[PDB]
């Protein structure tokens, strides 16, 4: 039925399911359902329906790149499925089920490869809460006691919660304000950041302090990993400008109090930022450990030239 419309409203109003493959489980859900029982013609009328419902879905807040990402991957499974087909619903829904089960284990396998990086007594450093970086760092509690420096930035700040969820289970964290990321980072090694979405050229679109942070990395020459799973490799190299973000209400940065000053003064609030591929020095991923400058072909491994 048209419960997807509710879903089309659900992404419209906001209220995030915290990126935990819930957008992916949902997009797989609705694509499974529209894939299940709909109109049927042989010659990709299903694919045309995927383009229509696709572009209607992408008409949401243009930041949830996972929605269109798994949409396009469903299309590539359709194209290869027909490619071998040269009863298709059985093969398509089965392979989509296999992609679901493969998606069902990202946060474990991307966290197994952790002992091979962090060593004893090694002052790691991140910024901003992320599920994968916390799970990833929790499987390195069967090794020695390092430190963790976490930045408290990007207000409204969703960051501390992580400083709790770590320090009551693990290593000796300290929490620094965002405006002190250059007295620190003279005494550190091995920076990690989680990623909101990563671009085709090799860019990280992340939380609103990622840049200003990576610049310090390629100033003191410390390597920064951006641990990010699959299904977040977005096409469309950074052409569209200023729709790249989320501008939120300036209540979060200035209070509605202090009247009259708020007549003539301009307030800005960006949620994301731009990390170019000239500063990332490894990707830890779900299947391999690929470098920055290789990421290109990995994208060609997944998609098809209908990247629009």
């Amino acid at each position: 039925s048209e419960r997807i419309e509710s879903f089309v409203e659900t992404l419209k109003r906001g209220g995030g399911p915290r990126s935990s493959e819930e957008m992916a489980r949902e997009t797989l859900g609705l694509l499974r359902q529209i894939i299940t029982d709909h109109r049927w013609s042989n010659a990709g009328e299903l694919m045309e329906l995927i383009r229509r419902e696709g572009r209607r879905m992408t008409a949401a807040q243009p930041s949830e790149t996972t929605v269109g990402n798994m949409v396009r991957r469903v299309l590539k499974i359709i194209r290869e499925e027909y490619g071998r087909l040269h009863q298709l619903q059985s093969n398509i829904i089965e392979a989509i089920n296999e992609l679901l089960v493969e998606l069902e284990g990202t946060m474990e396998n991307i966290a197994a490869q952790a002992l091979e990086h962090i060593h004893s007594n090694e002052v790691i450093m991140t910024i901003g809460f992320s599920r994968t970086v916390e799970a990833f760092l929790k499987e390195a509690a069967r090794k020695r006691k390092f430190h963790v420096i976490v930045a408290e930035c990007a207000p409204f700040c969703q960051g501390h919660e992580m400083a709790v969820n770590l320090s009551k289970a693990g290593i000796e964290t300290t929490v620094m304000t965002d405006a002190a990321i250059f007295a620190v980072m003279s005494r550190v090694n091995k920076v990690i950041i989680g990623t909101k979405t990563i671009l085709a050229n090799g860019a990280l679109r992340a939380v609103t302090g990622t840049h200003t942070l990576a610049l310090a990395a390629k100033h003191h020459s410390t390597p920064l990993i951006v641990c990010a799973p699959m299904f977040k490799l977005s096409p469309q190299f950074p052409n569209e400008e200023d729709s790249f973000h989320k501008f939120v209400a300036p209540e979060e940065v200035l209070p509605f109090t202090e009247g009259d000053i708020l007549e003539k003064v301009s307030v800005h609030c960006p949620v994301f930022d731009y990390v170019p591929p000239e500063l990332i020095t490894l990707f830890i991923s779900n299947i391999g450990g690929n470098a920055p400058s290789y990421i290109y072909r990995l994208m060609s491994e997944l998609y098809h030239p209908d990247d629009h």
Partner: protein, 355 residues
């Protein structure tokens, strides 16, 4: 059985993952001497490593392929087994034994995994002699293919740049960087090599007395003061033995303290490696994958023998002697592989092909 252990001294804080080893001889308190079912043959080589009697980053592959060729040419195929899972399980703790003796590899296993493939690929119904001789035969064709008949071919590319007038600079011992820099005096083109060598287990002398019997002239400088060859160099053919998919070049501990001490004088840096010795890991720094080794070798008998041995009796003075290093591929130019002179950043592109 296979006790192992025997760690000696206090590791220097920081990395404790790595285990230091000393010359306690492993079984010199342990092993048996009729046959001692741990190893029919591999106890020979396994004893031969620990003293320092092979140790070249190549030809360990030749050694392990030789001993595994004999032991594979000794198997018995019991009355209730398919001999694929049987032998393929049987080779496990023996390779673990050599793994215990020395850190097992500097990409040596690629061979081991290959053996596990060829063992697993065995047909389910044949003669023991048929599959046996077939197996060791393939085990020969491998070392003929990727170890023998490639290093010759990866010299023909190297002449194309090594031409008359230049002043090359190799570093320490090398396995290929003697062949493809000594099959270039024959066929003319005079030059003047300068070699540079590191303070323990010097290893530079093996070059400087394996090259004067070719006739190309030489010079000699220790790595501590390689800031005088660099205003007269015209290349550096620093070759090494493990390429990691992030474009890292696992050399000996010296290199890439020269490379990023070269590119501040504008002389290029060209690596030379083979086609199996590149591995599918990724590492960011030195302190996750080194291999410490016997910190007693550091003893400079330079007069009154200032206490070196006495350190054990001293309080807090851990000496550390690392074995590998890392070269990040912003300070590395062309890699002269055995499939062309590919760019460094395409270190992964050789992987997908021939796979």
């Amino acid at each position: 059985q296979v006790p192992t252990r025997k760690d000696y001294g206090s590791k220097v804080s920081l990395f404790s993952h790595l285990p230091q080893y000393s010359r306690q001889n492993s079984l010199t308190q342990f092993m048996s001497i009729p046959s001692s079912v741990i190893h029919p043959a591999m106890v020979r080589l396994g004893l031969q490593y620990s003293q320092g009697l092979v140790s070249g980053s190549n030809a360990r592959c030749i050694a392990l392929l030789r001993a595994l060729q004999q032991v594979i040419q000794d198997y018995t195929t019991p009355p209730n087994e398919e001999l694929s899972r049987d032998l393929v399980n049987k080779l496990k703790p023996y390779m673990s034994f050599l793994t215990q003796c020395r850190p097992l590899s500097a990409s040596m296993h690629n061979a081991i995994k290959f053996l596990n493939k060829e063992i697993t690929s065995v047909g389910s119904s044949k003669r023991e002699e048929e599959a046996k001789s077939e197996l060791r035969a393939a085990i020969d064709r491998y070392v003929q293919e990727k170890i023998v008949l490639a290093a010759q071919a990866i010299s023909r590319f190297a002449y194309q740049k090594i031409s008359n007038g230049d002043v090359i600079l190799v570093y320490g011992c090398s396995s290929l960087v003697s062949r493809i820099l000594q099959e270039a005096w024959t066929e003319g083109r005079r030059f003047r090599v300068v070699v540079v060598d590191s303070r323990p287990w010097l290893e530079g002398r093996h070059t400087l007395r394996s090259l004067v019997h070719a006739g190309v002239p030489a010079s000699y400088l220790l790595i501590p003061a390689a800031s005088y060859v660099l205003p007269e160099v015209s290349k550096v053919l620093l070759g090494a033995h493990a390429l990691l998919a992030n474009g890292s070049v696992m050399s000996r501990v010296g290199t890439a303290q020269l490379a990023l001490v070269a590119r501040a004088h504008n002389v290029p840096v060209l690596v030379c490696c083979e086609t199996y010795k590149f591995c599918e890991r990724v590492q960011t720094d030195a302190f996750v994958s080194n291999e410490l080794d016997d910190p007693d070798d550091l003893q400079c008998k330079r007069g009154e023998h200032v206490a070196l041995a006495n350190w054990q009796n001293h309080a807090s003075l851990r000496l550390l002697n690392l074995v590998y290093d890392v070269t990040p591929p912003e300070l590395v130019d062309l890699v002269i592989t055995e499939l062309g002179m590919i760019p460094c950043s395409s270190v992964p592109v050789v992987l997908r092909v021939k796979s």
